[PDB]
Each structure stands twice: as C-alpha cells, then as structure tokens.
CSV table of C-alpha atoms in Angstrom, one decimal:
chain,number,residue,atom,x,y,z
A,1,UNK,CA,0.0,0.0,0.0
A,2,UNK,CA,2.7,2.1,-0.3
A,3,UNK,CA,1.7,1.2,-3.8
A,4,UNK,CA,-1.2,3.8,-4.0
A,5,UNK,CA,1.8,6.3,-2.9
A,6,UNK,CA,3.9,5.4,-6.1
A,7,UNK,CA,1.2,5.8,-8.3
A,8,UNK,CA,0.5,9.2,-6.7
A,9,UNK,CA,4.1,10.3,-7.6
A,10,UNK,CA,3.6,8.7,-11.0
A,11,UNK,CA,0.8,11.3,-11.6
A,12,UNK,CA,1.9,14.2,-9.7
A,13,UNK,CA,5.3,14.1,-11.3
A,14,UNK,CA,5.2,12.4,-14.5
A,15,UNK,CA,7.8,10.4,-13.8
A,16,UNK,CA,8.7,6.5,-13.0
A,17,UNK,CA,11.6,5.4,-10.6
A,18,UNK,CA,13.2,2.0,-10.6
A,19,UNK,CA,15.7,0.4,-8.9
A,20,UNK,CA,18.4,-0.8,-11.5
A,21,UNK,CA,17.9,-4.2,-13.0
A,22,UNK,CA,21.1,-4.5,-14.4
A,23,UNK,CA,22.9,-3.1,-11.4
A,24,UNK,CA,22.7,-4.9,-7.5
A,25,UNK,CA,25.3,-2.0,-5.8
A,26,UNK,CA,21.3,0.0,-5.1
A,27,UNK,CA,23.2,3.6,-6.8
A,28,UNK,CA,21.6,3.0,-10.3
A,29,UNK,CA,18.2,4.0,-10.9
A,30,UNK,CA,16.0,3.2,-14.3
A,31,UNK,CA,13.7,6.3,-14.9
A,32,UNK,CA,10.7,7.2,-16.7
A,33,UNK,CA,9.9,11.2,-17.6
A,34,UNK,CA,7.0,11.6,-19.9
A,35,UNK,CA,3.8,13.0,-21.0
A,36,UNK,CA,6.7,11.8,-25.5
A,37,UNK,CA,9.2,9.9,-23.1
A,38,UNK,CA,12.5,10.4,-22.2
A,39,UNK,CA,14.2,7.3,-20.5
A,40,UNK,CA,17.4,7.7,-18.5
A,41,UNK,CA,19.9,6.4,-15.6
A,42,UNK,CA,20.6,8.1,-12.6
A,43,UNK,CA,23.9,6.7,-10.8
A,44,UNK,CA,24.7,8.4,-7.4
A,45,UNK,CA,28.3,9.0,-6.3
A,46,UNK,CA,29.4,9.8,-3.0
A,47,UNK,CA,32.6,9.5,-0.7
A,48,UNK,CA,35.5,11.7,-1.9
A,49,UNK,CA,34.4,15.0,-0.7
A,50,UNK,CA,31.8,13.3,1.1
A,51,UNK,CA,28.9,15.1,-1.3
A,52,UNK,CA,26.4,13.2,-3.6
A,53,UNK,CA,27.5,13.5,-7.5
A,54,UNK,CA,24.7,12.4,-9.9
A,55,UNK,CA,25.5,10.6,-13.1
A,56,UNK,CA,23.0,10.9,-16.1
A,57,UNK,CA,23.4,8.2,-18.7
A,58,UNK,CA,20.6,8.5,-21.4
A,59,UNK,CA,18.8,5.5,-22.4
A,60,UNK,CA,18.0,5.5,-26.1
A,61,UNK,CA,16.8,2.2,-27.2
A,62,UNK,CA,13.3,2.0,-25.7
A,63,UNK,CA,12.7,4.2,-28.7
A,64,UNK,CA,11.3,3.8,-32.1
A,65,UNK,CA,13.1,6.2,-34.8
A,66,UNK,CA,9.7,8.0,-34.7
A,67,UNK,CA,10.3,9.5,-30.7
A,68,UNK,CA,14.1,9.9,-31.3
A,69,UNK,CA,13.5,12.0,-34.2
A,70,UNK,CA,11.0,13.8,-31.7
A,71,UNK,CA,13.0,14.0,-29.2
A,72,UNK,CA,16.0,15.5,-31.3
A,73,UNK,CA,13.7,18.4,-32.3
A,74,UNK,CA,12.9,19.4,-28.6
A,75,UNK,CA,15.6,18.3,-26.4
A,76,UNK,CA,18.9,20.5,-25.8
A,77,UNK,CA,22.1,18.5,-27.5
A,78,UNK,CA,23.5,17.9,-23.9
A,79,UNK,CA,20.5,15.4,-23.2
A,80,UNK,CA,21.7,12.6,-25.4
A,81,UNK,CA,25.1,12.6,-23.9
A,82,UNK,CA,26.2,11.5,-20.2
A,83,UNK,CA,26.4,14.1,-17.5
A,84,UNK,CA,27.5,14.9,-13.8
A,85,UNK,CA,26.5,16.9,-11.4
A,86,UNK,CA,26.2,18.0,-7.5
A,87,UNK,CA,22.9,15.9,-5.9
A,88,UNK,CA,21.6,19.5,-5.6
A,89,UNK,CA,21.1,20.6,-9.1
A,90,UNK,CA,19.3,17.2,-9.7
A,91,UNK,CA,15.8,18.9,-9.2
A,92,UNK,CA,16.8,21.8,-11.3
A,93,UNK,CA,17.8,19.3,-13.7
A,94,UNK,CA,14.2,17.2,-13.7
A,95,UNK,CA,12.7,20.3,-14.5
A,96,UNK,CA,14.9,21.0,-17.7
A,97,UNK,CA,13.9,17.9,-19.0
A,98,UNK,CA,10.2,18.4,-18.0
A,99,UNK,CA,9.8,21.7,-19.6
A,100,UNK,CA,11.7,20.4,-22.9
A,101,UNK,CA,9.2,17.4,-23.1
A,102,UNK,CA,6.6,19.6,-22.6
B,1,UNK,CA,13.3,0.3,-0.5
B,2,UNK,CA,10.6,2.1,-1.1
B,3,UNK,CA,12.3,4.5,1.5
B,4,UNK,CA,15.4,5.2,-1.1
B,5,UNK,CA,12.7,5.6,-4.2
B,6,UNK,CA,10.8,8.4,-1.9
B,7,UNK,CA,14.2,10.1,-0.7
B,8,UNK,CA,14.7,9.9,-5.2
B,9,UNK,CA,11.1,11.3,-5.6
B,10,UNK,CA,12.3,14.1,-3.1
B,11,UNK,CA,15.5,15.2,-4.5
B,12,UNK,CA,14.6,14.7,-7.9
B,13,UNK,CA,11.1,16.3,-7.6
B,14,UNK,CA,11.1,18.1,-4.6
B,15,UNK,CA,7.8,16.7,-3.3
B,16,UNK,CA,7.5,14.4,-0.5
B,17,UNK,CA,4.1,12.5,-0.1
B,18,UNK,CA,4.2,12.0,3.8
B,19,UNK,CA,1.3,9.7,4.6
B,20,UNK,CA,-2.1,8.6,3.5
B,21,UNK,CA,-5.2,7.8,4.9
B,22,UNK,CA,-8.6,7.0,4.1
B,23,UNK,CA,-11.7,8.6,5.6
B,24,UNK,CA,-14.2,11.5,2.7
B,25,UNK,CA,-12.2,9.6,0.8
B,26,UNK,CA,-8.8,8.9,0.1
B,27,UNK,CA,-6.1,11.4,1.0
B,28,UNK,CA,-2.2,12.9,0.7
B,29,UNK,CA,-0.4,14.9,2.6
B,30,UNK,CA,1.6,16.6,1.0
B,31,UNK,CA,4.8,18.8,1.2
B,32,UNK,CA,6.5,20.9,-1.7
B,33,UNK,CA,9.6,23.0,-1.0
B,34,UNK,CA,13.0,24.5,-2.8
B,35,UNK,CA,16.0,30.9,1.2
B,36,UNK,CA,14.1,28.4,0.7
B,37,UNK,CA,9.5,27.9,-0.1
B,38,UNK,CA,7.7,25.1,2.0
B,39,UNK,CA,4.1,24.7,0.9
B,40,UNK,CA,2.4,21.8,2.7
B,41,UNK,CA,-1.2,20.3,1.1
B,42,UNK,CA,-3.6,17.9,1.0
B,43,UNK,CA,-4.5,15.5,-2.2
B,44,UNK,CA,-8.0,14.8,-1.6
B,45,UNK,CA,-9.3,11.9,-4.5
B,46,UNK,CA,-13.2,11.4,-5.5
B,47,UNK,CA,-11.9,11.4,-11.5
B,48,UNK,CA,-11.6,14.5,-9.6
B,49,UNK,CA,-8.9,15.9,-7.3
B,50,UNK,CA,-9.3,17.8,-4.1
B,51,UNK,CA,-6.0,20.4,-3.5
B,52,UNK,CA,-6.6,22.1,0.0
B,53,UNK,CA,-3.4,23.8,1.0
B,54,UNK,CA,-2.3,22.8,4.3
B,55,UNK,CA,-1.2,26.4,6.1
B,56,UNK,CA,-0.8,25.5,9.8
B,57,UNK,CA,2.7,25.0,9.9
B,58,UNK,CA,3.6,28.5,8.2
B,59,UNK,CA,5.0,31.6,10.5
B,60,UNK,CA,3.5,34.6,9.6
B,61,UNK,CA,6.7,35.8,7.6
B,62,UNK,CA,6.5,32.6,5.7
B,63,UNK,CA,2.8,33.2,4.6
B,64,UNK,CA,3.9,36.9,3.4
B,65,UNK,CA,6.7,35.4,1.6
B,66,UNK,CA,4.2,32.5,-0.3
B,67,UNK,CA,1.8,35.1,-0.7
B,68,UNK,CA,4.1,37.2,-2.7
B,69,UNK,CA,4.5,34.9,-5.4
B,70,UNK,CA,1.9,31.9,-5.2
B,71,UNK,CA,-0.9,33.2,-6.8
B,72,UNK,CA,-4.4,33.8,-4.8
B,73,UNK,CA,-5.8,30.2,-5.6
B,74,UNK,CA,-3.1,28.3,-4.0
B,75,UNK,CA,-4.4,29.4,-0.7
B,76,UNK,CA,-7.9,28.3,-1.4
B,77,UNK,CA,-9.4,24.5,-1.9
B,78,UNK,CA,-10.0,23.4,-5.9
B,79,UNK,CA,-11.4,20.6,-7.3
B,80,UNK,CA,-10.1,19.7,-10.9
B,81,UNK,CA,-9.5,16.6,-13.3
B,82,UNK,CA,-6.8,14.1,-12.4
B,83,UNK,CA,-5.7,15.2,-16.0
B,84,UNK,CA,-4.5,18.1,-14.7
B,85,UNK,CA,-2.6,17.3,-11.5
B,86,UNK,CA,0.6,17.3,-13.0
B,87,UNK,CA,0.6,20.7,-14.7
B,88,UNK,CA,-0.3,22.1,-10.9
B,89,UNK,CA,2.5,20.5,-9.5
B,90,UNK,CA,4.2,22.3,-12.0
B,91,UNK,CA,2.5,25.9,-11.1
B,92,UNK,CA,3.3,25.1,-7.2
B,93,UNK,CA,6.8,24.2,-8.2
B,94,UNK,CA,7.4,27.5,-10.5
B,95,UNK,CA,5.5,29.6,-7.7
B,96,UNK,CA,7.9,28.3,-5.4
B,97,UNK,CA,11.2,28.9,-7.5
B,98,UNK,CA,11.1,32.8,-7.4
C-alpha cells in the first residue's frame, strides 16, 4: 500500500523510478519522464568530498526512430550525452527535462 | 526500499508525499519546497482531485513570503481533473522557484 503512494508520484510528477535491473550496488536507478518519453539512468556518487555526485546516462533504445526524431527536435544536444552533477542541481535538472518534453 | 525511491522522488522532484489515509475519501499529505519555499497540502481523491493547502505549519513571515509569489488560488481548496494534476505540480513548483 505504499503502492497507492507510487502511483500518486507517477501522476503528480510524470515520472517512474526504478531500482536498477542491471545493477545490485542499489546507486543505479531506471527512470521514466514523460507525457513523449524520455528514459534515463541516474547513478549516485558519493565518498571523496563526502557530497552526492549524480551521473546521467541516457537510455536510447526503448525508442522507435519516430520518438528519437521527436526528441532531437525538442531536447537540448547535452541530453543525449552522459552528464555529472552536485545531488543539488538534480531537481533543477528534472525540470529541464520536463519543460523540454513539454 | 521504497524508503530510497521516496528520498529519489524528493531530490529529484522536490515533493514528499508523507502519509495517507482513508476517511471523505482517500487522501495525501503533501509537502512541496525549494532561502528556501515550504508549501504543505492535502490530495484529496473522488476522476476528480481535491487540493486544499495545508497552512498551519507556516510563521506569519512565511505566509507573506508564499503570498508574494503563489498566486491567490493556491491558498484556497480546488477541485479539478486528475488530468491536470501534473501541470499544478508544476505551477506550485514554478511559484515556489522565485
């Protein structure tokens, strides 16, 4: 029942986490932004400094030449390659890609 | 778990669904932040959706600061499609990033 609370996320946000199939170390996450989908990885980083660093690793395949194309129109260049950045900027981030699917 | 996908949903949405309980209907509360803009609400469900904001918990130079850039209807109860739930999450969270 904390089941109703995902799908109340799923809604609100437009947006689907996962845990990582392919990855057991629980930093990867699979995730789902869409109203027109944009499928990504979200690896988190810490020790060193001791502060969170998010990797973004876009996830390409899930799509037909049709959304690609789509996609290429309305999403900034730096979208289809792999980033870094401080945990903080990761909501800022969320909302880039929200507004550009939009 | 579900623990580390919430703590995601939070940093990555800045919106942290607290509980939920079921009286009348089924509800959310609701928190939605960024200096920094705390807006707490209820998610009320009968489809519709019921948004009453949640004020309480506000000092009195909070509420001048929210009023200053949330506009008027964020301070009163709405009803609206579940269609649009999404896009108001989006108002609250531009409101909020002033």
């Amino acid at each position: 029942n904390s089941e109703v609370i995902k799908d109340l996320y799923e809604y609100l946000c437009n947006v689907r986490v996962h845990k990582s199939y392919e990855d057991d170390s629980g930093l990867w996450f699979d995730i789902s932004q869409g109203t027109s989908i944009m499928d990504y990885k979200l690896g988190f980083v810490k020790g060193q400094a001791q502060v969170t660093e998010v990797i973004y690793a876009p996830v390409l395949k899930q799509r037909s030449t049709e959304e690609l194309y789509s996609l290429q129109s309305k999403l900034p260049e730096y979208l289809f390659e792999t980033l870094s950045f401080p945990l903080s900027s990761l909501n800022q981030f969320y909302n880039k890609i929200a507004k550009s699917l939009n």
